Amino acid sequence: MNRLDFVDKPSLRDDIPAFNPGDTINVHVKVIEGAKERLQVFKGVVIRRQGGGIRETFTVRKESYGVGVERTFPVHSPNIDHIEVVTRGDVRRAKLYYLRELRGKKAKIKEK
Amino acid sequence: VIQQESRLKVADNTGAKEILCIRVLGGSSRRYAGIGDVIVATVKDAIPGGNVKRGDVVKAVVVRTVKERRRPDGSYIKFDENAAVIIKPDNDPRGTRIFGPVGRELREKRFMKIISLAPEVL
């Protein structure tokens, strides 16, 4: 328990899956382009959780056109429509920062 | 974040491969350059036979940055390299097409032409 758990409690969300660092995740992000409100898919490998409840973030890393991108959303953020797990991963660390220096075949995560 | 003497890979086909920052335009003694900030730069490396040559003073807008950017909703974007697009003085790219992804901070800095030529705006 924490002292401020009666303030974070109405802002929490359900329907967020149980994904671990090492999984492969679609993130659907609401994007305003003028006044259009479309919905953009971000598919990548979750490398990080930094917990705390309402203050918890996760970090996905894709390789876009020969250039790697990382996004760091908050969990329980209302600009995320839904999260869908594509592939579970078999890792040994909790932060997976060693993928920031790998490309190609060597930046592969196993399939359990 | 980019300041004076930083080197940036070049994300279009003007002929330049590597430019070096000189100022960060936007005010007196402005120190850093995020996404959507205009750089006066010199051209340090080029492709042989291209349009621009070594030692030309250009303007350029930063489109990729290794340092994170706090977007106004709590999310961040981070790239593996520093990239820029050499631009005309009416905020249009000098080359014909843009390589690699760019940031969505270019939308509110009225860079509509770089968005339409980029492969993926994030």
Added chain:
Amino acid sequence: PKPTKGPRLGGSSSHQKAILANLATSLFEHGRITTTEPKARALRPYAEKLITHAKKGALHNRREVLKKLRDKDVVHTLFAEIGPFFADRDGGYTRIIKIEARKGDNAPMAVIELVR
């Protein structure tokens, strides 16, 4: 435990692991140790966490004590005599009483002892 806010006992911090382990071997062998007052305030949340492994008393709790204490004869009395002595007490297994300061450097002294 709560680490030292400030400079460590006996100089380095590799030296404080050795001081607090040697005082525990002596506190569990004799039952009453006279030492300086800062080295006994620092023993009290360090010795009372070794007795808690003796109240549980499995193999995993005995291997955990052998990480810190190197003396097997005092590990035996911890898991056969001291540990089952405190089976109905909820912490606070030690006690610090203050002695007269010693001559020569005016170092304030105290005894640390088990409760009974």
Added chain:
Amino acid sequence: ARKGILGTKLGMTQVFDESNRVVPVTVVKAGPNVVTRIRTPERDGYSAVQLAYGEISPRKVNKPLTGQYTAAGVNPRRYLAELRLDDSDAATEYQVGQELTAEIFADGSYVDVTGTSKGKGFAGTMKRHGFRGQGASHGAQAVHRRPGSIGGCATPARVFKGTRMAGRMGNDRVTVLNLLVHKVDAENGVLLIKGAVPGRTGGLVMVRSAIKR
């Protein structure tokens, strides 16, 4: 015409608003207060109102301070401060014994939060005042963090008063102006105040209404 409340900083969390932007807030328990005294110009020369805050055991309060509450008919609280008003209009909306809870502020009101900054101890001049210091190499001998010069030469043969030197930093009354109230919560007696508030988590905080807005 200037509302105020005493309270306790409880820490910082984050919350989102309707435009899906993140808002870093500082949770303040603007707890229940009680008046205990009204300052009038015909008696005191100024116009203010006292405010009592905090639950204390009645044995921890000594006999001079206790009888100041017995004249007001109020059980003794821990803290006791004043809210400075203007030259009129105090005893028209405050009475001795009134209960000022947290919903005197609305949502989207701007407030001034004053408090007591965290202690930083005896601090040097590269921390207390932002001096640049000397270099870290190129021959510099033992002056890496030292101030440098402190005066002129034989005119003037002194150091001017107010010359920024080392010393103790912090524990000062610090008022932060024009902070935005995000959500008042009368169920819990909690104001969500946008931004940062001076103090450690547990310290006393006076939340007044802003005038600059």
Added chain:
Amino acid sequence: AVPKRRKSRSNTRSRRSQWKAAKTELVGVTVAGHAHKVPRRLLKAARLGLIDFD
């Protein structure tokens, strides 16, 4: 730096009279039928036979 001049009699005595021992406060303890005086921080050790009264 060196001292410029010698300090007078009035200025050396004003400082030197502040190097003074701060006394402790004694409380009364009766152990083994004899009354003694220890400071209050050694009150428990007087009652357990750990203070040597000489």
Added chain:
RNA sequence: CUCGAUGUCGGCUCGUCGCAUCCUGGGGCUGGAGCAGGUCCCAAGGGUUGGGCUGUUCGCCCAUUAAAGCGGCACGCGAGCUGGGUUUAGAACGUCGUGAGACAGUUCGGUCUCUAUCCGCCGCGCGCGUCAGAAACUUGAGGAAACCUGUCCCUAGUACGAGAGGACCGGGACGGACGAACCUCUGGUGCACCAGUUGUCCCGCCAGGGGCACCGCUGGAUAGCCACGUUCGGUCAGGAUAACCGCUGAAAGCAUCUAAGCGGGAAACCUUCUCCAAGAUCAGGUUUCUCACCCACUUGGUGGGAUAAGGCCCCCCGCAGAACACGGGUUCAAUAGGUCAGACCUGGAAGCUCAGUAAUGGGUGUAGGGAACUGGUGCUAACCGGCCGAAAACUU
């Protein structure tokens, strides 16, 4: 003036002041259409960038900017730092001298000593004073800090103008730089946290661990401290004015801003906002509490003793802290520790079992280990207690 020593140029760090104003602010005249300008007058509140070359100062150049001001203070500042130049001894080139040597001619090399006594400054205590002893909240005499500014849109392609061009005044949005507080996020740090791993010794050996090798190395890391992070500030409105524009109006039947009298008027000045502040010796105000005894003497506004209200010391500690101080707590107690449960960090313990020739892999199991943040729990230490501390009157 200094030879029984007053350390020299530049740069770094830290400043303070002047105005002969570079920017921003207010104006008169213009050979001021408009936009930009020129010139003079008022104005020192803040701001006045980063690089290349040179020992440089100065200066040229590059890219910006609202602008890249000029000066004093031992050409401010070496018991604060630098030592590249000048200005010791080595050596060389050119030139001069028969030579020894010499050269505001050049060139490479070349020790920067001091534990702060005094005033001064920055902080923090002890003492007494404030006509009894105390506690709480206070008024503000007088001070400190802060003071910068851009781009785009609308008004408007309007006024102005042959066109090209292109506004005043008002309204709005978004920034640069700088200061403050802060730790939710992002990021840094992590010497009693978790995991992998090399060398070696040891725990009798196996299995499991430890000591030491920069914390041995490596991958992470909560709290604290932090900035690269977050939020916020320099506002609005009055007063008295500078240059300058006036109104009414004489001396001087006219005219004149002035002699009588009254206005408008600037980032300067004073209030307003932030902070300190009754040692403001004119030592303030509103309150509540105790509001009381005894002895000695040369009977004195006299010495001691013992108390009340209340405080201090000791004790348990703190995100308060150099020591002191300040803050919380002391059994009618959750103040620190232990302990129990969460949170969070690490990422799947040991033992047993199964699969493999084995290295290793799966299962029991979001396992085990663990510190700071949160809540219950009266188990250990906050005790069986010492030291201070309350009144002549009198005049109107």
Added chain:
RNA sequence: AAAUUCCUUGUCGGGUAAGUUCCGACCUGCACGAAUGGCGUAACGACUUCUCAACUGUCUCAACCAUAGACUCGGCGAAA
């Protein structure tokens, strides 16, 4: 235009976004020159000078941690 060039940051080319230093020439050598040697030269240099890759707290711009002092307590106890 030099370990020699005062005038001098000579002029011209190269390098740099920008080069009083550097490399290339020019010859108006204040004051070059052939054993007080002239002009070159592979290797070699804790020598002087300039450029570049790689790298970094050198810097923009600083932050945190451990230890030895500084600070507190007890002993001894100087100096200009």
Added chain:
RNA sequence: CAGGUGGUCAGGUAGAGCAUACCAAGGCGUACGAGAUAACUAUGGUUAAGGAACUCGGCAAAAUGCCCCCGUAACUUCGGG
């Protein structure tokens, strides 16, 4: 008294080694201590983004590092580099 002093003997595991690391036999803990998260100085450590923009000058620090195997320029006194 952190300086100076000639020869002799010289173990284990890792290692090319009398380097270095941890150990044997054998010595020693060496002569003020005890505490405490101040500034500041020393001696070390790590550092986002940038990478000489610092500076008289890359001074200091950082970096490169070992064995086996491919491969290796101008220039040269034919050896080298």
